[PDB]
């Protein structure tokens, strides 16, 4: 009955890790959005000069 509680805290560690993975995926989406707006913005930067 102590081993079971230690397994519980292990599961909590696992869910924290997957939450960090979710945050990493959010970083990925922000990066891709920024690139998808940069592709358009470089056109304005070019036409400015």
């Amino acid at each position: 009955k102590q081993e079971q509680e230690k397994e519980l805290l292990r599961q909590k560690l696992l869910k924290e890790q997957e939450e960090k993975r979710l945050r990493e995926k959010e970083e990925q989406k922000k990066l891709l959005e920024q690139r998808a707006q940069y592709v358009e913005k470089t056109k304005n930067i070019l036409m400015f000069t």
Partner: protein, 209 residues
Amino acid sequence: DDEEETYRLWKIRKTIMQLCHDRGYLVTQDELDQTLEEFKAQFGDKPSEGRPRRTDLTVLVAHNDDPTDQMFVFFPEEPKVGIKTIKVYCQRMQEENITRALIVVQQGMTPSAKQSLVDMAPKYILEQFLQQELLINITEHELVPEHVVMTKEEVTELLARYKLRENQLPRIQAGDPVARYFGIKRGQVVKIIRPSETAGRYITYRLVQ
């Protein structure tokens, strides 16, 4: 000089990117801290009558939450910028709905130019920065604590909490380098967080005026 000029341009660009990020405009985590090598490889590293020429490295960035709001960052070649240059800049800005901008002047603009700059103020906000003032990011300095521009709602919340008239709060003139860095204007409160050696942390407020 060539190499030194390229270094100066890269530093200025990094400073401006950090500034825009601090204000709230979304920027790449890459360009926020891009080294100088990729800068050379991108532009050409031959500022002396070559590819990395001013007015070509300008950057337009949109606000984080309001994608409709942007601001230009020009780099006029004239050491002593006149009014004609700002006039044409504003004209070319008028095509888009943009309202804010930021001018980087080599040397101080003529006094006649400041009059024009302020004149178009309510319709098109535009401010100036000397490159000599951009080569370093003050906000990182050990003395300069961390500022946080406050929204009107929370300013009213604060004033209503302390039952204190906003006229009674400390003052900070707009000319202050931190003020100009954040783009705050008159009638707007800036939160200051300082490490207090007797209280750990201490938060104060300063109304611009």
